[PDB]
């Protein structure tokens, strides 16, 4: 096997001709390209380039594909070096893959002339002037919907009707109803246009923010339908109307990062709740058995010290009651300490995941 | 192109003559300076110097300006190496730029003989003896001003006048007024001298501590003016007198670092308050709908569980009330946990910014 000597700035690197021909379309392998740098006087290919990098670009030839950056070569000087050597776009994506950088930007505009134009208007708000106008209008509509959900349940406005039941009306006299119907009109129109102008109708019931729009529309329609057509469903439907607060996540990049963080960390949250349940059983049992004898004590059950055990460990602190025996006080100081000890353990994993997803936007 | 071989301690580094002449005023490029080190016997320029550094000083010649320190060469040995090679002050500032070190010390004393001398007396307190005397007097005046703002609103001194209104006086009988006027006299004199002796009068309404002095002077003048010349302005003006506590930041280097930290971290504080508002709506709605049926419960509105939701999540804990149902207790333990989970997420960014600005004084 004949040998080839490449001299990158005085540093002689040597290899067998077979190794650099494994990849033939590359700069060193291609006979013609490499011929330019060759110097016939000393039989060596002189190049003037970074010394620490050309070591990694000979490993790629001798290892069938692996591309790993030395830890003392900065990213920019390496990216340029794969380019001069002509290792190919497959190679540079693998280098990006080894530095783990997200590479997905797939935006298939339909390109049917009108579907594409209105999709550009309604999806990407930075594109135009009316796109930012539509973003501002949608955020203000969501905000007044939240304000109607809370001011509706306030009692000061219902005092014309605060009367015993034994004595959503379409009478259009209640102002909360007509402003509520205007909000649901806007949500329905916006969702139907985002359905009919999308470039992928099969994938539309896959994105989670679309399923947030649907479950925000639903309960007003089923209460209108059953009203102009139950008592178990009504208390559930009145609390599925709180999900319009999560429909404010299409316009925020902080709520979307908290959704990624809470998805990618479910094992840690399960460990958090499991450790809490263990500690609550243990400490509530010990305070019940160390304070039951005293005639002036208040713990009357083991499933009655559970609230006291959760508030002392998390530190909110109120308690249903408070220990009055010397023994209850020793099991209450151990409970206070063990609480922060057992809830601070899985939290650094969660904040590290957030910090990663928070800087990956950059 | 003729080639030049430089031998730094046995390690042969080689380059084309063109590369080291790109920068001609430098030590290697200048023919005469480099001629001293040259040894004609072996046609190599022997130098005895650090091996890991001379690699980076050949990249600068071959990369048109980039200067990056290898990660295994300590700062001091590198700083000296750019000096021996004679790369120029533009080069050493760029090295300081790449280690990101603050380089701004612009103090334009006016140099008009008297304006410069009294500016040195009043601005830089370490310069003299009377400068530290003036610093000590200003700090003591600020402290007794805070003591008058709080002891004035105490009620024990007003019990000679605690009478119904239907029955800032310049009568000079109230001792709080005359000591208050002495404090505002000192603030006004000090600010007017710092105006008339400054070397840049156009930039004087740009520094934030100067605007703190002005908004600390203002409300005493407008209440004196309107008194010897409203009922909406009076309750606002009585609370803009609390900014004399921030006028104590010219004499502290910890308050100035907290101001830099809170300026450079506003996106994180916005995320903190936004996450809190989301959690407060969600958990107050769930506890209102899980405890309304019980006839002995106390939550009468969704905008009545808001305080309970803020104190449980932050852990102050008092609550307006406390859950009495099994369902209120499950939505109150989840609220306690999710509070610390959603407020501990943006805080490491803020403490990292503080730690950076806190050690950059060194």
């Amino acid at each position, epitope marked *: 096997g004949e040998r080839v000597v490449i001299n990158i700035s005085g540093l002689r690197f040597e290899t067998q001709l077979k190794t650099l021909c494994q990849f033939p379309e590359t700069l060193l392998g291609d006979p013609k390209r490499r011929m330019r740098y060759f110097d016939p006087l000393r039989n060596e290919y002189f190049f003037d380039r970074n010394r620490p990098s050309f070591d990694a670009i000979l490993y790629y030839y001798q290892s069938g594909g692996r591309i790993r950056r030395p830890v003392n070569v900065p990213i920019d000087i390496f990216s340029e070096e794969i380019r001069f050597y002509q290792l190919g776009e497959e190679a540079m994506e693998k280098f990006r893959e080894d530095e783990g950088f997200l590479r997905e930007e797939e935006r298939p505009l339909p390109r049917r002339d009108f579907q594409r134009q209105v999709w550009l208007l309604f999806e990407y708000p930075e594109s135009s002037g009316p796109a930012r106008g539509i973003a501002i209008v949608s955020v203000l509509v969501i905000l007044i919907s939240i304000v109607i959900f809370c001011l509706e349940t306030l*009692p000061e406005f219902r005092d014309e009707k605060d*009367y*015993p*039941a034994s004595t959503g009306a379409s009478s259009f006299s209640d102002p909360f109803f007509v402003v509520e119907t205007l909000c649901i009109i806007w949500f329905s129109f916006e969702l139907l246009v985002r359905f009919f102008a999308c470039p992928s109708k099969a994938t539309f019931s896959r994105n989670i923010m679309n399923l947030i729009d649907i479950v925000a529309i639903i309960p007003y329609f089923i209460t209108l339908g059953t009203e102009l057509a139950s008592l178990a469903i009504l208390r559930v439907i009145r609390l599925v109307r709180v999900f319009r607060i999560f429909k404010l996540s299409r316009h925020s990049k902080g709520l979307q990062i908290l959704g990624q963080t809470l998805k990618a960390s479910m094992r840690e949250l399960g460990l958090l709740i499991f450790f809490l349940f263990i500690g609550v059983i243990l400490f509530s049992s010990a305070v019940y058995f160390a304070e039951a004898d005293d005639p002036t004590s208040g713990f009357s059950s083991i499933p009655d010290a559970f609230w006291w055990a959760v508030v002392t460990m998390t530190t909110v602190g109120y308690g249903d009651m408070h220990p009055v025996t010397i023994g209850g006080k020793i099991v209450g100081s151990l409970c206070a300490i063990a609480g922060v000890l057992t809830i601070a353990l899985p939290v650094p994993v969660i904040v590290s995941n957030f910090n990663y997803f928070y800087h990956r936007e950059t | 192109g003729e080639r030049v071989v430089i031998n730094i301690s046995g390690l042969r580094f080689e380059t084309q003559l063109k590369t080291l002449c790109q920068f001609p005023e430098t030590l290697l490029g200048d023919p005469k300076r480099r001629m001293r080190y040259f040894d004609p016997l072996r046609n190599e320029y022997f130098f005895d110097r650090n091996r890991p550094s001379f690699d980076a000083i050949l990249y600068y010649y071959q990369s048109g300006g980039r200067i990056r320190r290898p990660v295994n060469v300590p700062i001091d040995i590198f700083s000296e190496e750019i000096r021996f090679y004679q790369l120029g002050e533009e080069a050493m500032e760029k090295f300081r730029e790449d280690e990101g070190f603050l380089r701004e010390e612009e103090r334009p004393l006016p140099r008009r003989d008297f304006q410069r001398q009294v500016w040195l007396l009043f601005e830089y307190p370490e310069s003299s003896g009377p400068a530290r005397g003036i610093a000590i007097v200003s700090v003591l005046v600020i402290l007794i001003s805070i003591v008058i703002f709080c002891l004035e609103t105490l009620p024990e001194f007003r019990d000679e006048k605690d009478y119904p209104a239907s029955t800032g006086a310049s009568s000079f009988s109230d001792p709080f007024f005359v000591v208050e006027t002495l404090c505002i006299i000192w603030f006004s004199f000090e600010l007017l001298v710092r105006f008339f002796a400054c070397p840049s009068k156009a930039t004087f309404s740009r520094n934030i501590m100067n605007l703190i002095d002005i908004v600390a002077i203002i409300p005493y003048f407008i209440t004196l003016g309107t008194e010897l010349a409203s009922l909406a302005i009076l309750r606002v003006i009585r609370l803009v007198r609390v900014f004399r506590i921030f006028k104590l930041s010219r004499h502290s280097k910890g308050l100035q670092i907290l101001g830099q930290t809170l300026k450079a971290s506003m996106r994180e504080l916005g995320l903190l308050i936004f996450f809190l508002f989301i959690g407060v709506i969600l958990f107050s709605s769930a506890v209102y709908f899980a405890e309304a*049926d019980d*006839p002995t419960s106390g939550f009468s509105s969704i905008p009545d569980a808001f305080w309970w939701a803020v104190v449980t999540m932050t852990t102050v804990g008092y609550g307006d009330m406390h859950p009495v149902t099994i369902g209120g207790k499950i939505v109150g333990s989840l609220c306690a946990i999710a509070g610390v989970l959603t407020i501990a997420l943006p805080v490491p960014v803020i403490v990292s910014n503080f730690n950076y600005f806190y050690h950059r004084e060194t």
Partner: nanobody
Framework: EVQLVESGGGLVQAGGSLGLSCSAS????????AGWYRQAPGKQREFVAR???????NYADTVKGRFTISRDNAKNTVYLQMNSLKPEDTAVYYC??????????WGQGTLVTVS
């Protein structure tokens, strides 16, 4: 589980003065709206008084200025002070406390008939 018991009834003559009381357990009145309802013989119940939680008192036209409804806010007690009773009053009375949209509770009844 909850109960609304009341007393103070009987018969009275013209120009009388009396005070029915409503008490309960299983239901703090500090937290719920309450009122007194009467049912004249022959027609449906009408309202004597209402004290919506928060101290807002309203009365019907017949009892205006002759009746007061007060929650001692202590002892879970609501007391009505009727005054100068007239023969049109003859009726059977009832007590109540409710939360709009959730629950409604009644008393057993206690009558006051004016001679």
């Amino acid at each position: 589980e909850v109960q609304l018991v009341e007393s103070g009834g009987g018969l009275v003559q013209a120009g009388g003065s009396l005070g029915l009381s409503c008490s309960a357990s299983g239901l703090l009145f500090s937290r719920n709206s309450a009122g007194w309802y009467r049912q004249a013989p022959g027609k449906q119940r009408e309202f004597v008084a209402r004290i919506r939680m928060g101290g807002s008192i309203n009365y019907a036209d017949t009892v205006k200025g002759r009746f007061t409804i007060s929650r001692d806010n202590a002892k879970n007690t609501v007391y009505l002070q009727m005054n100068s009773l007239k023969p049109e009053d003859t009726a059977v009375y009832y007590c109540s406390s409710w939360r709009t949209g959730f629950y409604e509770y009644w008393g057993q009844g206690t009558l006051v008939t004016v001679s």
